[PDB]
Structures are given as C-alpha cells and as structure tokens.
Design an enzyme around this catalytic site. Structure first.
Site, PDB file in Angstrom:
ATOM      1  N   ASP A 273      -3.602  -0.891  -6.535  1.00 23.28           N
ATOM      2  CA  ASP A 273      -3.522  -0.594  -5.102  1.00 23.28           C
ATOM      3  C   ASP A 273      -3.588  -1.897  -4.307  1.00 23.28           C
ATOM      4  OD1 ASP A 273      -3.361   0.883  -2.703  1.00 23.28           O
ATOM      5  OD2 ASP A 273      -5.099   2.125  -3.140  1.00 23.28           O
TER       6      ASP A 273
ATOM      7  N   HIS B  60      -3.369  -1.621   6.547  1.00 26.45           N
ATOM      8  CA  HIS B  60      -3.266  -0.564   7.566  1.00 26.45           C
ATOM      9  C   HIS B  60      -2.802  -1.050   8.930  1.00 26.45           C
ATOM     10  CE1 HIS B  60      -5.512   2.876   5.325  1.00 26.45           C
ATOM     11  NE2 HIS B  60      -4.598   2.271   4.585  1.00 26.45           N
TER      12      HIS B  60
ATOM     13  N   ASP C  72       0.821  -1.200   0.000  1.00 26.79           N
ATOM     14  CA  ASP C  72       0.000   0.000   0.000  1.00 26.79           C
ATOM     15  C   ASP C  72       0.869   1.269   0.000  1.00 26.79           C
ATOM     16  OD1 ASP C  72      -2.110   1.791   0.379  1.00 26.79           O
ATOM     17  OD2 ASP C  72      -2.551   1.099   2.409  1.00 26.79           O
TER      18      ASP C  72
ATOM     19  N   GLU D   1      -2.636  10.229  -1.022  1.00 25.98           N
ATOM     20  CA  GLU D   1      -3.864   9.404  -1.103  1.00 25.98           C
ATOM     21  C   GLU D   1      -4.423   9.159   0.304  1.00 25.98           C
ATOM     22  OE1 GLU D   1      -4.410   6.076  -0.061  1.00 25.98           O
ATOM     23  OE2 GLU D   1      -6.122   5.830  -1.138  1.00 25.98           O
ATOM     24  N   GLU D   2      -3.545   8.945   1.274  1.00 26.61           N
ATOM     25  CA  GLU D   2      -3.996   8.543   2.604  1.00 26.61           C
ATOM     26  C   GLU D   2      -4.600   9.699   3.398  1.00 26.61           C
ATOM     27  OE1 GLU D   2      -4.050   5.403   3.557  1.00 26.61           O
ATOM     28  OE2 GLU D   2      -2.517   4.402   2.398  1.00 26.61           O
TER      29      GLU D   2
END
Ligand SMILES: [K+]
Ligand SMILES: [K+]
Length: 326
Positions: free
Chosen positions: A211, A295, A117, A156-157
């Site tokens: 992704d 995550h 990621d 992106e995060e």
C-alpha cells in the site's frame, strides 16, 4: 517459534536475474500501470473497467480468477463491491498471498487518481504475475503444496470519516467468507505436516499487503514480530541487490535503505486487519511516514518516482522467487 517453511536463500544467479530491468521490462510495467492511473471510485464505470482488466490479465496467464462480489451498506447508501482473487494453483494447500486495494478514494475536493494508493501496487502485482509467468507455471507442476495468490480488494477506502463500519468493506467481507468456509488438509494438496487447517483462511500462509507505494525513499519496518522471519528476507534481498550494484540511485556510491532492520511503534489500519484478527500472518509493506501526497489531489502520475518503483519491483520479484523457489 520458527517459520513453518524453511526459507532457502536465493542463488546468486537468480538474484542477478531478478535484479535486472530491461527496456522492455520497464515498458511492460508502465503499460500495465497506465491502465490503473484513472479514477477508480466504487461502483463507477472506470472502476468496472479496471476490475475487468485485472481479471482478463490473469485469466490470460491461466490463473484461476474469482470475482467476489456483494452489496454493502455505507454512509452513502448501498454500494456494490467486488474483490478479485487470482490463484495460480487452486489445489495447493498453502498460499503466499500478495494483496492491495484497487478502489480509489472519493475525494471531497475532486478527481483523485490515488497513484500510490494503490495504482502502483495494483500494477506491481500484475507485473509480477506477467514477468514471472514462465517460472510460476513451472513451479505449479511441482506438487509441493505451495502457490501464489493475488488479492485485489475493493472498498478499502472510507466514504466519510474512517471507522470500523466505514472502511475495509472488501477485506472484512472476504475474511469472514473464508473464515466460515470450512475445509481440512485431507481435502487439499500437500499441506505441511503440522498444519492446522479448519477453513480457507488457514490456507493463507502469509499475507504480504502492499500500500502507498511509488513515492521516493519509502521507509518500511517490521510491523509484526510474527512475520519477522519473512520480513528479514526483504531486508536481505535489498542488501544483496545493493551489494551487486543493481539498485537505481541518483549518484554513485549510495545504497537504498527502504527496509529498516527494526520494528516500529505504529498502528496502521488497512486491509490486513480482518485477516490479522483471524490469525493470518501479515507483512505490511506500507511506508511510515506515509507519502506527502497521501489523500491529496497530488497523489498523481507525475509525483511517482520511477527509479524507486523499479527498485521495489526488483525486491518483490526476488522475494517471490525466493519464497516459491522459482
Ligand atoms: K541465466
Ligand atoms: K487511501
């Protein structure tokens, strides 16, 4: 409605070649990947070093590279962001766009590598540019109005809880920028006859967003009916590579089944959204379910599955080769 570009099936010769992985191919990919397996938090030194590596790698391949930098408000205050856009032939009307994000999540628990990621997708895009370089440089000479474009999104995060305002900083910025940058077919090289080109975003023929790649046994689905004709090429390529015995499996007489020949009920927010909202066709190459490491601090190098990565690299190389008729 049929796809605007007639999709010619890859010749057997080319399928076999794209499905080969040499020892130096594996080594080259892994050397590339090592550059990304570092924390890449927005605004940090390592993040800057990763960006510089992306830019230099593609400039060294004679691509046009733009660094789309800006400052944006976040829940953590003002932050700098820089998208990287690499274009093989700037003049070509239409782009096959492959994309990923290069920032890594600022994780509440500590140091986060974000191997899937999206360190692996980042490495995969550069690997494609490097491994297909000769063929891409040849394709650029054709004057056929199609080229390859790689976009490495920043930001992106989310910094805190994912929301419309806290996430997708780079992609929201770039989509707006390109939407507001007016142009026309008359100004571009060899647009397809019935093209409606009014701005830069219209030049994105399809955006293939990678992704969360790198874990074992991903499951993909066609998330958009609009790009079913393109998605089905991934299904076909995977099937052909399996038939030819070119996929790495742990035992004899197995097949990979990454690209399911179905659609799914799944809403995923990612960098495609701001482009989707502006009518860019999307193929979203993201697994459902997400990898178990998603995550967590366990999204690291050792939890990658290298045979899966190799298999995906074969599919992606064959796909780009088919689409661009390399
Ligand atoms: K050959
Ligand atoms: K993420």
């Amino acid at each position: 409605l049929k796809w605007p570009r007639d999709l010619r099936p890859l010749a057997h010769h080319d399928l076999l070649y794209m499905g080969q992985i040499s020892e130096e191919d594996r080594g080259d990919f892994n050397a590339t990947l090592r550059n990304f397996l570092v924390p890449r938090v927005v605004g940090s030194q390592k993040h800057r070093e990763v960006r510089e590596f992306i830019v230099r790698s593609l400039k060294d391949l004679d691509w046009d590279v733009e660094e789309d930098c800006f400052d944006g408000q976040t829940p953590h205050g003002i932050k700098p962001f820089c998208n990287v856009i690499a274009t093989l032939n700037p003049s070509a009307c239409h782009r096959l766009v492959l994309a990923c994000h290069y920032d890594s999540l600022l994780h509440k628990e500590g140091t986060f590598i974000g191997a899937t990621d999206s360190a692996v997708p980042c490495a995969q895009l550069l690997y494609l540019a490097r491994s297909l370089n000769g063929k891409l440089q040849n394709q650029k000479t054709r004057g056929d109005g199609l080229t390859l474009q790689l976009v490495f999104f920043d930001g992106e995060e989310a910094f805190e809880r994912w929301s419309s305002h806290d996430s997708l900083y780079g992609s929201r910025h770039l989509a707006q920028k390109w939407h507001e940058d007016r142009t026309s077919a008359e100004r571009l090289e060899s647009c397809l006859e019935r093209s409606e080109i009014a701005n830069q975003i219209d030049r994105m023929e399809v955006m293939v967003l990678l992704d969360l790649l790198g874990a074992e046994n991903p499951r993909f689905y066609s998330y958009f009916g609009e790009t079913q004709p393109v998605y089905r090429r991934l299904v076909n390529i995977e099937s052909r590579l399996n038939d030819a015995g070119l996929m790495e499996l742990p035992r004899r007489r197995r097949r990979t089944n990454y690209f399911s020949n179905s659609s799914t009920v799944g809403f995923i927010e990612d960098d495609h959204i701001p482009f989707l909202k502006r009518s860019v066709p999307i193929v979203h190459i993201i697994p459902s379910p997400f990898p178990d490491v998603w995550h967590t601090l366990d999204d690291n190098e050792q939890n990658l599955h290298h045979p899966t990565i190799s298999n995906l690299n074969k599919i992606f190389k064959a796909f780009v080769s088919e689409y661009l008729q390399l």
